[PDB]
Design a protein around this ligand. Structure first.
Ligand code: HEM
Ligand code: HEM
Lengths: 732, 735
C-alpha cells in the first residue's frame, strides 16, 4: 500500500504501468526531463539576457521593504520576515551533496515535489508565497531559483549582516527532478533512515557510516535532526551527525560552525501547538489550499499558534539584528532539558534572565533556549574550540559566515562566467573551480586548419586516442552543479591525470604530444596562443571529422575555440575526486555496484550531460566505431573498420547470426559467438549489450543499423559530439 | 507488498523513493510529456508520409513473401511457412484496440515496447518481430515498424491464398512506451488479472456483459478472451458471451467476429508442447543475453517441435498454410471431447476423427482434429451458430466478411482516408473510417477569409464567447490515439453532437443557423468559390480570438487553414460518435468527474489526446475563461472584469492572495473565492479552474502568465495553441 493511492484512477496515466510489472528494468525517464517543449518560457528564452536587464537594486529594495510588511494570513514574527527568509534560502541551498553534485538551490526545486512537502520545509510554502508578488512584479527577469536565494541574502543585509555579494544566473526548471537519489526509505523523518544507516541504531558508532552519497540523517531533512540523533537529546552524538552531514555537503568544521551560529543569530523556531492540529503537506492538501499545506486548525493557524518543527526556541535577545548572542548564550548559560508546547526536546536556561522577546507581545519575555543541535557545537572538541574562539573574536565568525554563506548559495552555480549581477564577489574561491583569463590572441579558422593537420600527424596521436581523450575530459561535466567539462584542460592535472579510468601512462603520452603541438604554435604565431584545453577538444574533433571522411561522409565538424588552461592551484584534488566515474559507457570503462548496474550508471551520466536517448545511443556506437575505449581494447568494438565512423557497432550487435552469452560471473562480460562457424567473434560489456536488450534503446540502435542511414548516423554523432564538447562553454 | 518494487533498490538513473511514491493520488502530468520530438531518433522534422511515398512497396511485399518460407534455425517455421505466425503478429498488434476510448490498435507499433512486448498473449511474437527485422533493415526509414507488422500479416494472408481488399500505410513509429493507456487496475496477468474488471464476480455466464468500461479484454495481458474458456473453465457457451463482449468493446459485431475468428484460424497452429515451468522470463524481465527476446524454452533447442506459446496444441485445418473452409467443416462436422494438451491446458479433440491433420515438422505424421474452447463458442451461441452454419454451406460469404473485417481490424485506428498511403488503398469508403466527401467549389483565398471573418463578427446572435466556445467544442472531439474527431466534417451540426448536453443544444442551434446565413450569403456570390460550414465554425472561433486579442491591445495574425468539408449524417454513425461525448470538459467548464477519474484527471487525459504540452493546456484554459467561453455562458472560472478580451486575468486573479477559496458543494466540484478583507463572495470556480492554482507544476505555468508584462506572450502562446488544436485533424494539408 505504500506508493499506492486508495482510489485507482482510470485516466491521465492511471492503471498498472510498465514500471509496476518490471520494476528492475532500466528506465530512460531521467533522459526525458527538462525538455524545451515543456518550458513555458520557450526553448529560445535566454535567462542571462533577461536578468542583465533586471533593475537589480530595485528588486533588493522591494525585498527589504517586504520584510517588515506583515501579511494577515501569515503574520511576521517581531514584525520582520527576515529569519523566515533566511531559512527559506538556507533550505533551498541546503540540499546539496558534494559527492554527486545534486541538490542545492540552482534549479529552484523547492517549489516542486518532493522538496515542497518535506517535513523540514514545513511552512516554507508560506515563505515562497510571501515573495511571489516580487516575482510577479519583475516577471521573467528574475527566476524563482535566484529570487529565493537573493531574498535570504537581502534579509541578512537588512538585519545588520553585510554579505560578500551575490550572483544570479539560475534558470528556472519546470518539473520535479526525479533523477535525484534522496534515499530508498519509504517513510519521512522522524523515521526515514533505516536504509541509510543499514538498520544501525548505535547513534555514535553509526554517525560516520551514513550511506553515500547522502548528506542528511533522515529522509525529509536538510542535514540533521534538531532533537539529536533519532530524537535522542545527546548533543555529543548530534555533533557527529553534524560533521558527517555538513561534510557530505562540502563544508568543514569552521564553515559548519559559522553557518549554524550565523543562521541562528536570527528568528526563531515554531512549536506552539501539537502536530495533530496540522493538515496535509502541500502535495497531499485539497484544492482550497491552492498550493499551500500544513494548515493549522488552532485559531487562525498562524501568529502565536505557528507550528513548523514542534520546537519553540528563540536563540537571541535581538532576533532581527545581527549579534554575538548565539555564542554568548550557548557558552554562558547552564542548560536544562525541557519539553516544548508541541512535546519536542529542547534546552532552556531555567535560571537565566527573562529577557528574550516574544514575537507578538512586546510586554512578554522568555528565558534563553537552544536546540540539541546547537549544544552539539560545545559538546565536540573541535567545535568547542571554534565556538570559544569566536565568542571572544566575533569578527572571525562574521568573516567565516560571510564566506560560508556565499559558498552555500553559489556552490552549484558553476563557473564564474555564469554569475550575473552588479555585486559578484571579486575573490576567486576554490569551490568555484576557477579559471584564468586567456593567454594572447584567439586562434582563427586558419590556425585551426593548421592545428588539425598537425595533430593528426604527430607522434603518439591517432584517431582512437584523440577521440577517447576528448571524451574522457568532457564527461566530467555534470549539469546538476555545472562542474566539470573540457574547459581548463583539467584532465592534464591532478587528480584526473592519475585516474585509473584515464589510463594514465597512455594519457601522459597523448598530453605530451599535444603539448608539443602547443609549444610549436605558441611563440611562432606572434601573440596568438592556443590552450591545451582547446587542443584536446580540437584533436578529438579533427579525429571525428577525418573518421567521418573515411566512412564516406564529408561533414564540417564545428569547433568552438577559446578554452583556457586551469592551474593546479585552481584545481583542488579533493573537490575533483567527486567527479571520478565508477563506470563510463562511452569509453567502455568500469563496472556496477551492488546497488547500480553498469547500464544504470550510464543512463545516470547521460542525464548529467543533458543527453536524450538518441544522443546517448549514437555517441556509444560512434565511440566503438572509433576504437575509443579507455584501454584501447576491442570490447564492444564490433567493426573491422576501427577508426572509421560507421554504424558497424549497431549492425553487428543486431546480427542474429551472433549469439550472446555471459562469460564472467559478475555479469559484466559477454561473448558474441558466430552460430554458423561456432567461433567467438566479439567481446561485449553491459554498456554495449543494453542497446540490444532494452526495447527503447534497441529501437534507436535499429535506426542506425538500417540500410541508408550511414550518413544520418554520422550527422547525429557529430551533433551529439559538439553538444557534449561544449557543455561547459558558459563563456560563449 | 512486493508488487511494483524491485528487490534490489537502485541508487542511479531515477532509483530512490520518488514523488509519486509519497503522494500517489496527486495529479501527474506524465501523459503530456510523451512522444516529444527530441526523443524521436528520426528528428521532429521527419515526414513519414513523404518517406513512405518513395518506398519500393512492391519490392517490400515480394521480400516478405520470400521470408515466409525461409526458415531460420533459431526459430524454425511450422510447415516450412511463417504465415500463421505473421498473421497472429499482425492480428495481436491491431487487436488491442478499444472503440470507447480509441486506445490500443496497431497504429503506433506499440507491440515492440513494454508492456505489450511482454504480455502473456504476445508470447513468442518477439520471435516474429525479429524474423521481419531484416526487411525493416533493408527499407530503413521508408517503412515504419507499425506499418510493417500489419503489412506482413496482409501479405501472409495473400500468399496463403486469401486475397484481401488492399492495404493502407501511414502509421508513423513511436519511440517510447505509451503509459497513458488504462489497460486495467489489476496487479496480476492472466490466468489472474481480472478481479477488478469483473468487480470480484466469478459467475462466468452472468458477469460476461458486465466487463469494466472501457476495457476490451477479459484478463490483463490478453488480446480479447481466454482460449480455455472464462477463468479457464472450458464452457463454450460462456466463452461465446465473453467473445461478444470483448469484440463488441473493440467495435466488431457478430458477423465480423465470426469472420475474424474463423478466418484467422484457417491458418497455422497453437503451441503447447512442454510445461510452462520450462519457460524463462518475458522480454522485459530477461537477461542481456536474450537481446530483446524472451520466454526462453529450456527443452531441447526451445523451438520447432518443442514450441510453447499458449500451452494449447491445436491445428485447426488439414492445410494450415492455405486458405480453406476446413475450420467450419471441422467445427460443425466433428463431435468434440474435452482433453488436455501436452502442457496440461483444456482443449477439444475429435477422438473418433480422421487422423489426417499434418505435423508441422514431419510430412509423414498426422493428428486428429482439434479446437479451442473459444472456437467451440461459435457453435454454442444461437447467433454465432446461425452464422457458422450459413458459412459452412456458403464459404464465399465468409470470405467476403473476413476481407472486410480484416481490413477494418488493421485500419480502424488509422484515421481519415487522407492518411492512407500506398498503391492498394481500397476504394470503398467504410463507415468506421468516418468518411468525408470531396469538396464542392474552389478554395476560398485570403481576401475571402478576411471578408468572411468580418461577416461572421457582424452577424446577429454571434459574439466572441459563443464563437470561441463552439469552435473548441467541435475541436476537442479529436483524439490522437485513433485519429478520430476534430473540426473537419462539421459533425457538431449532425447527430449525436448537436444534441450533446455539453454543447448547449439550444444555443448551438442558433449559432449554426447564423453561420449558415453567412454561408448562404457567400456561396453563389463569389464565382466558383464555396465555403463549408466546417470552415465557418473554425473561422468564426478564429476571428473571435483575433478580435479578443485586438480588444486586449494586441494586433496579432491568427492563422486560418481553409479547406474543411461538411460530412453527411450518413457518414456520421451515432454509435461511433457517442464514444467521443465528454463527461467533463475543462476548456468549457462542463460536467464533472467520478471517484476513479477526477475532473482534473479527465482534463489531463483529454489534453494528452490533443497532444498538448502542460503549457499549451494551461494557456488554453486561461484564455477560454477570459473569452467567457463556458459551454453554458456561466461565470464559473471567468475571473475577469474584461470578459471577451484575451487577457491572462484568469491567472492573475486565481493567484491573488486576497481571495480565499472554499468548497461549496459536498462532492468537492464547486468552489467559492471570497475577498478576505470585504468578506464578499467574488468568484465561483470548478476543479478544472482551481487545479491550476494547486498542482505545483501547473501553478508554475499559471504564474508565468500572471506575471506583470507577460500580456503579449500570453496572447502569442494562446494563439499558437489555438491554431494547433483547430488543425489537429487536417491530414489533408501538406507538411
Ligand atoms: C545543524 C544544522 C541545523 C539545524 C538542525 C537547524 C534546525 C532548525 C530548526 C528546527 C528550525 C525551526 C523551524 C521552525 O520551527 O520554524 C530552524 C530555524 C532557522 N534556521 Fe536552522 N538549523 C540548522 C542550520 C541552519 C543554518 C546553516 C542556517 C543558515 C545559515 C539556519 C538558519 C535558520 C534561521 C534563520 C531560522 C529561523 C526561521 C524563522 O525565524 O522563521 N539554520 N533551524
Ligand atoms: C476469440 C478470439 C481468439 C482467441 C481466443 C484466439 C486464440 C489463439 C491462441 C491461444 C493461439 C495460439 C498461440 C500459440 O500457442 O502459438 C492462436 C493462434 C492463432 N490465431 Fe487466434 N484467437 C482468436 C482470434 C483470432 C483472430 C481474430 C485472428 C486473425 C484474424 C487469429 C489468428 C490466429 C492465427 C493465424 C494463429 C496461428 C499462429 C501460428 O501459426 O503460429 N485468431 N489464437
Amino acid at each position: 500500500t505504500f506508493g499506492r493511492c486508495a482510489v485507482k484512477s482510470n485516466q491521465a496515466g492511471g492503471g498498472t504501468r510498465s514500471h509496476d510489472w518490471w520494476p528492475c528494468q532500466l528506465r530512460l525517464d531521467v533522459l526525458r526531463q527538462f525538455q524545451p517543449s515543456q518550458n513555458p518560457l520557450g526553448g529560445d528564452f535566454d535567462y542571462a539576457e533577461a536578468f542583465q536587464s533586471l533593475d537589480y537594486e530595485a528588486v533588493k529594495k522591494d525585498i527589504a521593504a517586504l520584510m517588515t510588511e506583515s501579511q494577515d494570513w501569515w503574520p511576521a514574527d517581531f514584525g520582520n520576515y527576515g529569519g523566515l527568509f533566511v531559512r527559506m534560502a538556507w533550505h533551498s541551498a541546503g540540499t546539496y551533496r558534494a559527492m554527486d553534485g545534486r541538490g542545492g538551490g540552482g534549479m529552484g526545486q523547492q517549489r516542486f515535489a518532493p522538496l515542497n512537502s518535506w517535513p523540514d520545509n514545513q511552512n516554507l510554502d508560506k515563505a515562497r508565497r510571501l515573495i511571489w508578488p516580487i516575482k510577479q512584479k519583475y516577471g521573467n527577469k528574475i527566476s524563482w531559483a535566484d529570487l529565493m536565494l537573493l531574498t535570504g541574502n537581502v534579509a541578512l543585509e537588512n538585519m545588520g549582516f553585510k554579505t560578500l555579494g551575490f550572483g544570479g544566473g539560475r534558470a528556472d526548471t519546470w518539473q520535479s527532478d526525479e533523477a535525484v537519489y534522496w534515499g530508498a526509505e519509504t517513510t519521512f523523518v522522524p523515521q526515514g533512515n533505516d536504509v541509510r544507516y543499514n538498520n544501525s541504531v548505535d547513534i555514535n558508532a553509526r554517525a560516520d557510516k551514513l550511506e553515500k552519497p547522502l548528506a542528511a540523517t533522515h529522509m525529509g531533512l536538510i542535514y540533521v535532526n534538531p532533537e539529536g540523533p533519532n530524537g535522542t537529546p545527546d548533543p555529543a552524538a548530534s555533533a557527529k551527525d553534524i560533521r558527517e552531514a555538513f561534510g557530505r555537503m562540502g563544508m568543514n568544521d569552521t564553515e559548519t560552525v559559522a553557518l549554524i551560529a550565523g543562521g541562528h543569530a536570527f528568528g526563531k523556531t515554531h512549536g506552539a501547538v501539537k502536530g495533530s492540529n496540522i493538515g496535509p503537506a502541500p502535495e497531499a492538501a485539497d484544492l482550497g489550499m491552492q498550493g499551500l499545506g500544513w494548515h493549522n486548525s488552532v485559531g487562525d493557524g498562524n501568529g502565536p499558534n505557528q507550528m513548523t518543527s514542534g520546537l519553540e526556541v528563540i536563540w537571541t535577545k535581538t532576533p532581527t539584528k545581527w549579534s554575538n548572542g548565539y555564542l554568548e548564550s550557548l557558552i554562558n548559560n547552564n542548560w536544562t532539558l525541557v519539553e516544548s508546547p508541541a512535546g519536542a526536546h529542547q534546552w532552556e536556561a531555567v535560571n537565566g534572565t527573562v529577557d528574550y522577546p516574544d514575537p507578538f507581545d512586546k510586554t512578554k519575555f522568555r528565558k534563553a533556549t537552544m536546540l540539541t543541535s546547537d549544544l552539539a557545537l560545545i559538546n565536540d572538541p573541535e567545535y568547542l574550540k571554534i565556538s570559544q574562539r569566536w565568542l571572544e573574536h566575533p569578527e572571525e565568525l562574521a568573516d567565516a559566515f560571510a564566506k560560508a554563506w556565499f559558498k552555500l548559495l553559489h556552490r552549484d552555480l558553476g563557473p564564474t562566467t555564469r554569475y550575473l549581477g552588479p555585486e559578484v564577489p571579486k575573490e576567486s574561491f576554490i569551490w568555484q573551480d576557477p579559471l584564468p583569463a586567456r593567454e594572447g590572441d584567439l586562434i582563427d579558422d586558419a590556425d585551426v586548419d593548421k592545428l588539425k593537420a598537425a595533430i593528426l600527424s604527430t607522434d603518439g596521436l591517432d584517431v582512437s586516442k584523440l577521440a577517447s581523450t576528448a571524451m574522457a575530459c568532457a564527461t566530467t561535466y555534470r549539469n546538476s552543479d555545472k562542474r566539470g567539462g573540457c574547459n581548463g584542460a583539467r584532465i592534464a592535472l591532478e587528480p584526473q591525470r592519475n585516474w585509473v579510468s584515464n589510463n594514465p601512462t597512455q594519457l601522459s603520452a597523448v598530453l605530451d604530444a599535444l603539448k608539443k603541438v602547443q609549444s610549436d604554435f605558441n611563440g611562432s604565431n606572434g601573440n596568438k596562443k592556443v590552450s591545451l584545453a582547446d587542443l584536446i577538444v580540437l584533436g578529438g574533433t579533427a579525429a571525428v571529422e577525418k573518421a567521418a571522411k573515411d566512412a564516406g561522409v564529408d561533414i564540417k565538424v564545428p569547433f568552438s575555440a577559446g578554452r583556457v588552461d586551469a592551474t593546479q592551484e585552481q584545481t583542488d584534488v579533493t573537490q575533483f575526486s567527486y567527479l571520478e566515474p565508477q563506470a563510463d559507457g562511452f569509453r567502455n570503462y568500469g563496472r556496477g555496484t551492488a546497488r547500480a548496474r553498469t547500464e544504470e550508471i550510464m543512463v545516470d551520466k547521460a542525464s548529467q550531460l543533458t543527453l536524450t536517448p538518441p544522443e546517448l545511443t549514437v555517441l556509444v556506437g560512434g565511440m566503438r566505431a572509433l576504437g575509443a575505449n579507455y584501454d584501447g581494447s576491442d570490447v564492444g568494438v564490433f567493426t573491422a573498420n576501427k577508426g572509421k565512423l560507421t554504424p558497424d557497432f549497431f549492425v553487428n550487435l543486431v546480427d542474429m547470426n551472433i549469439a550472446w552469452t555471459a562469460s564472467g560471473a559478475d555479469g559484466e562480460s559477454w561473448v558474441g559467438t558466430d552460430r554458423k562457424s561456432r567461433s567467438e567473434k566479439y567481446k561485449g560489456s553491459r554498456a554495449d549489450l543494453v542497446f540490444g536488450s532494452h526495447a527503447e534503446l534497441r529501437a534507436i540502435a535499429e535506426v542506425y543499423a538500417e540500410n541508408g542511414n550511414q550518413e544520418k548516423f554520422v550527422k547525429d554523432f557529430v551533433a551529439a559530439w559538439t553538444k557534449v564538447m561544449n557543455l561547459d562553454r558558459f563563456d560563449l
